[PDB]
């Protein structure tokens, strides 16, 4: 019961200067074709077509509101029934992941009016103001993580290093996170704008705000005067594997975080296929990113929505077939 | 009730108000002693005098206006003159010495001595209102009372009221013709309240109305009595749909929604198209088509300017009289066809049509004719920055040698305020360079 969507991103200006060839076509509503140039043994080049079918496929002209309406917008009428719901951002680095989740990259700033964080935090409140659901008298509170160097940090408080422990009921609890109480939608935009300004990110010329950590934004839905948890919507922005040509100026510091981004995703790649077959010991405790994402897969009231991000060009055709094959494996999953 | 308060400051502000309050007394049928005649057992508020005239009981119409001057001489023409019992006696406020072409006197020395008396009178008119629309401040850039006092008053009117619209009807200095030597110092200093406190500021100047009287109207030798009747037709058409019936009526807030793009881009120039003498009003084809073209003509502007050097951003067509709206759309589509008229590339829905039924009133002794149709065109354009560059250059000449500064410093302001108001007007002129240019990636 996992919905999978894919989003081809458009071609940048610099990739036109290097004369990049676009190979990803989205001809229909829910298909995609990868045009792979292949050569035979006698130097006769030919072309392969890799069809895919998803729940919904996005073009390169789609905006973040349309990506929102088909991914996280159906999952708001779930959090007000008692369940919990998440969404991933899984792909290559540079493939538009924090442009979808975080917001539109407006150069020096982050226009957080776009993004999936703000558009769902707005839509909780409109849903909370309906007379059917206003009767429950709930309290919306928001928290916001950061997973850097395998360890959990916090971004509401400045640099509170955090632990990952477990309840006796087999429930992972990060403790002690900061959980501010949100008044309105003008309050939750103040968290996200202050949150993204403190997220650890590199500084270069190609991707001046490349993600260096697996940011997790939670909106906790609590009844008033009970201190339980009635619903959670946990966003997940990943960091993305990077192992193509990342040899620019990488010192001992750059590949220190560099090999730990790739280590955290192999643990995530294994838990997908281990859930694919049956009865195996699900390696959730390998990386702490997989221990946070435990309730997304095996949750009895969990409805997730992975958004597979795709770089369009020819030089990223290798990572593209890698990334699309996992999302097809994510789609073919029946937990319970 | 769609009431409006007219505020008339300084000699030019009073003396325009003599031409405005002459005209509404004729549009509504009010004698100079405030009386409507006995042959009206009809709806007065259906003729809607009640935006400019509060009806005193036992048949008496007193205006919603306050005349303020720092000089006793100009308002004593209203006492007596002919309107000596039209106005309430307590809303004609005189000082004892004028500000005497000195912003520092009108704003600091002399102006604070009657500013409590002026503001207290406006509240007695604001309390008589039911549905107050906004303020109509008339003044002149380049007086002492028109600039110094009006800057003092618009600060205080923004604190007490704030949310109301506050329209200004200024007279801007002309490029060649000037009557004061210190005329540029008093115009840079009124820049701060004009952009910050007013919500839609209009500008006219005397040269651009002298030429309209000479060319469009064949008056060989105009006086100020000829000119202020042309200012008053712009005002009488703008505030017309508040107080007359018509298809496509426009409130004072439907201007600002449709005329002002950004909160600092609120300086629109007005025109008025059938300025035709009565002998030239025969041989006429004064249709909707010809009267729409005349507003876009660069010679018929009320400001010495040329909108072929900049781009329009919005227009606002307000028609009076025998006007059918399908004639207007056939006249708009000819205006959008022409390549002399450049709109901006973020406008595309060009401009707003308002239509009214009440045709204009011919003032007895007037210069205008009796027309079936008339058009005021309020229109933002980037070409009004060129009038500002011609006046910064006069300020920059005299303030380079710090000429008349010693009069201003010894009256209640500092030398440093010249360097702030020069930068402040240079920032607007940078805004019109950056709002006119279309964007690429």
């Amino acid at each position: 019961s996992i919905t999978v969507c894919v989003r081809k991103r458009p071609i940048s200006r610099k990739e036109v200067n290097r004369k990049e060839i676009d190979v990803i076509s989205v001809p229909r509503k829910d298909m995609l074709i990868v045009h792979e140039p292949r050569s035979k043994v006698d130097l006769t080049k030919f072309l392969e077509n890799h069809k895919f079918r998803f729940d919904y496929a996005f073009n390169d002209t789609c905006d973040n509101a349309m990506v929102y309406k088909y991914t996280a917008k159906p999952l708001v009428k779930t959090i007000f029934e008692g369940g919990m719901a998440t969404c991933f951002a899984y792909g290559q680095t540079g493939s538009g992941k924090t442009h979808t989740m975080g917001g539109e990259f407006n150069g020096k700033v982050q226009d957080c009016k776009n993004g999936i964080y703000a558009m769902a935090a707005k839509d909780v409140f409109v849903t909370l103001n309906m007379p059917r659901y206003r009767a429950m008298n709930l309290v919306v509170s928001a928290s916001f993580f950061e997973i850097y160097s395998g360890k959990v940090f916090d971004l509401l408080s400045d640099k509170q290093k955090l632990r990952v422990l477990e309840d006796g009921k087999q429930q992972v609890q990060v403790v002690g996170l900061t959980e501010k109480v949100v008044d309105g939608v003008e309050e939750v935009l103040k968290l996200i704008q202050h949150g993204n300004a403190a997220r650890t990110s590199g500084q270069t010329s190609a991707n001046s705000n490349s993600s260096r950590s697996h940011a997790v934004f939670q909106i906790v839905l609590r009844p008033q005067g009970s201190t339980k948890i009635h619903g959670k919507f946990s966003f997940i922005d990943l960091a993305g594997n990077e192992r193509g040509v990342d040899t620019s100026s990488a010192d001992r510091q750059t590949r220190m975080e560099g090999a730990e981004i790739n280590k955290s995703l192999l643990a995530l790649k294994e838990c997908i296929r281990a859930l694919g077959k049956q009865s195996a010991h699900l390696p959730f405790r390998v990386s702490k990113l997989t221990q946070v994402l435990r309730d997304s897969f095996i949750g009895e009231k969990s409805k997730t929505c992975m958004i597979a991000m795709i770089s369009p060009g020819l030089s990223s055709c290798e990572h593209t077939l890698n990334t699309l094959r996992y999302a097809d494996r994510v789609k073919e999953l029946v937990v319970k | 009730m769609r009431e409006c308060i007219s505020i008339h400051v300084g000699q030019a502000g009073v003396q325009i108000g003599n031409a405005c309050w002459e005209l509404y007394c004729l549009e509504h049928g009010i004698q100079p002693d405030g009386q409507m005649p006995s042959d009206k057992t009809i709806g007065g508020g259906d003729d809607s005098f009640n935006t400019f005239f509060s009806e005193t009981g036992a048949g008496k119409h007193v205006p919603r206006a306050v005349f303020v001057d720092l000089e006793p001489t100009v308002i004593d023409e209203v006492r007596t003159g002919t309107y000596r019992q039209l106005f309430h006696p307590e809303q004609l406020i005189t000082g004892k010495e004028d500000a005497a072409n000195n912003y520092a006197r009108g704003h600091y020395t002399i102006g604070k001595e009657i500013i409590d008396l002026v503001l207290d009178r406006i509240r007695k008119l604001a309390d008589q209102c039911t549905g107050l629309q906004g303020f109509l401040v008339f003044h002149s850039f380049g007086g002492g009372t028109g600039s110094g006092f009006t800057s003092l008053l618009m600060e205080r009117l923004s604190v007490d009221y704030g949310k109301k619209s506050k329209l200004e009807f200024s007279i801007y200095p002309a490029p060649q013709v000037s009557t004061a030597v210190v005329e540029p110092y008093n115009s840079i200093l009124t820049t701060h309240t004009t952009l910050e406190h007013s919500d839609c500021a209009f500008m006219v100047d005397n040269e651009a109305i002298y030429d309209i009287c000479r060319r469009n109207l064949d008056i060989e030798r105009p006086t100020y009595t000829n000119l202020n009747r042309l200012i008053s037709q712009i005002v009488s058409s703008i505030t017309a749909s508040l107080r007359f019936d018509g298809a496509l009526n426009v409130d004072l807030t439907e201007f600002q929604t449709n005329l002002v793009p950004y909160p600092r881009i609120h300086f629109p120039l007005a025109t008025y198209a059938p300025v035709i003498s009565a002998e030239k009003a025969y041989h006429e084809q004064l249709s909707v088509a010809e009267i729409t073209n005349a507003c876009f003509e660069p010679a018929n502007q009320m400001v010495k300017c040329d909108p072929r050097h900049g781009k329009y951003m919005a227009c606002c067509l307000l028609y009076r009289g025998d006007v059918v709206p399908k004639d207007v759309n056939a006249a708009i589509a000819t205006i959008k066809t022409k390549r002399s008229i450049q709109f901006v590339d973020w406008c595309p829905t060009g401009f707003k049509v308002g239509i009214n039924y009440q045709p204009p009133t011919v003032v007895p002794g007037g210069d205008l004719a009796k027309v079936q149709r008339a058009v005021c065109m309020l229109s933002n354009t980037t070409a009004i920055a060129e009038a500002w560059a011609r006046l910064d250059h006069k300020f920059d000449l005299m303030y380079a040698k710090r000429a008349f500064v010693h009069w201003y410093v010894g009256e209640g302001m500092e030398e440093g305020e010249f360097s702030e108001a020069r930068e402040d007007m240079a920032a607007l002129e940078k805004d019109y360079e950056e709002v006119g240019v279309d964007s690429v990636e």
């Binding site: 349309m66 | 449709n258 002002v260 399908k326 060009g350």
Partner: protein, 429 residues
């Protein structure tokens, strides 16, 4: 049984409805005071579709009049039919809307909508078995766009199974008399998507072109444009009031005009429309009426249906005519023009035939089309919107009234999404 509440809002919606209550009140013989002076017994058997009977055989319309400005209310009272309405249904504020969507949907409209819905429920709770609603309003104003879609989105929370349709005026780039009308129309197409069962999209450029070319009028006024629109509005609910050979209610149309939900934007049309003088030259027959209903120059929406495919259409005939000629002429069109109809739906056309023509002519007709060519409307707005909003022009008049940009970009994207819903169902087999 099967009552209709009429909620006319704004300036444009009140001017149409004031002309609308002068056509219905002629079809049933209602005096300008409200008494009955008809001669046919069918004029009273279903008069309760629109009219509550009051004391002394007076017939008061079930109409609710909304504005944010007292002026248009004063015009309708002082018009020909100010006597007809009840004075408790003239709901109006004092402070005008500003041609501003935010001011009529958030600030000064939400203050009034409590005092309007309390009057809507006085009409709806007195009916025997209410059928639905109708808004008459204007996409492009403050009250017709904003206040109209606040009224709509608060009735679906209370009457969630009644046919709500609108007769809404959409702007056109050829005829503009409002600078900020793309902002005001995009923010209300977004509301009409999720809340409405049928939407009869009308333009004004399409209504002068009917007056100029078809009717050969010399000086058209708004009284002529609203006269066409009011002839459509009576034509749709005809079989609800008069007996017929085939019947079609509001719900019966919506079942087989709307294939998928969210595709509920219709193109109206009326026939016959002749000039005066050139009516002695046209013979009135069913092949004559059919040619007008499918010519493009008799559409009340400024589109050409040759740039798309009709999903479904409906044709409501009024008069003592046959049923073979109706069933054959509606057949000889969708075979001659089979490239202009969607081919995965056989027999795209619905025929309704009443028995009572209007009171001055025999054999009228009404064309209602669900065409894929209505994406020409929504892209002409969504090009103007995205040319202003990318520079954030005229935006502080909206963000100053409670709104923010997140409501814009959502509303822009929902307009651009249903363009890609008529586009899929136009082409691709």
């Amino acid at each position: 049984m099967r009552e209709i509440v009429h909620i006319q809002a704004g300036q444009c919606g009140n001017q149409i409805g004031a002309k609308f209550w002068e056509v219905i009140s002629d079809e049933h013989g209602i005096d300008p005071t409200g008494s009955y002076h008809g001669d046919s017994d069918l004029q009273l058997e279903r008069i309760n579709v629109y009219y509550n009977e009051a004391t002394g055989n007076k017939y008061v319309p079930r109409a609710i009049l909304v504005d944010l400005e007292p002026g248009t209310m004063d015009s309708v009272r002082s018009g020909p039919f100010g006597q007809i309405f009840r004075p408790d249904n003239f709901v109006f504020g004092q402070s005008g809307a500003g041609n501003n969507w935010a001011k009529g949907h958030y600030t000064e409209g939400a203050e009034l909508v409590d005092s309007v819905l309390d009057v809507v429920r006085k009409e709806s709770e007195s009916c025997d078995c209410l059928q639905g609603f109708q808004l008459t309003h204007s996409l492009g104003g403050g009250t017709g766009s904003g206040m109209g879609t606040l009224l709509i989105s608060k009735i679906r929370e209370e009457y969630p199974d009644r046919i709500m349709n609108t007769f809404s005026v959409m702007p056109s780039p050829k005829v503009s008399d409002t600078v900020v009308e793309p902002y005001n129309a995009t923010l209300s197409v977004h509301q009409l998507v999720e809340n409405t069962d049928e939407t009869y999209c009308i333009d004004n450029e399409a209504l002068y072109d009917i007056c100029f070319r078809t009717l050969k009028l010399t000086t058209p006024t708004y009284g002529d444009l609203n006269h066409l629109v009011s002839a459509t509005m009576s034509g749709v609910t005809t079989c609800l009031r008069f007996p017929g050979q085939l019947n079609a209610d509001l719900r019966k149309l919506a079942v087989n005009m709307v294939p998928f939900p969210r595709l509920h934007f219709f193109m109206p049309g009326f026939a016959p429309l002749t000039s005066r003088g050139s009516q002695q030259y046209r013979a009135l027959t069913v092949p004559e009426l059919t040619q007008q209903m499918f010519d493009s120059k008799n559409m009340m929406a400024a589109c050409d249906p040759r740039h798309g495919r009709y999903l479904t259409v409906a044709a409501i005939f009024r008069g003592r005519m046959s049923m073979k000629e109706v069933d054959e002429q509606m057949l000889n069109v969708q075979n001659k023009n089979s490239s202009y109809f969607v081919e995965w739906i056989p027999n795209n056309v619905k025929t309704a035939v009443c028995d009572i023509p209007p009171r001055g002519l025999k054999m009228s007709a009404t064309f209602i089309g669900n065409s894929t060519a209505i994406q020409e409307l929504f892209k002409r707005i969504s090009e103007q919107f995205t040319a202003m909003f990318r520079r954030k022009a005229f935006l502080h008049w909206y963000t100053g009234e409670g709104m923010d940009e997140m409501e814009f970009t959502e509303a822009e994207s929902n307009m651009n999404d249903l363009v890609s819903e008529y586009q899929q169902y136009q082409d691709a087999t």
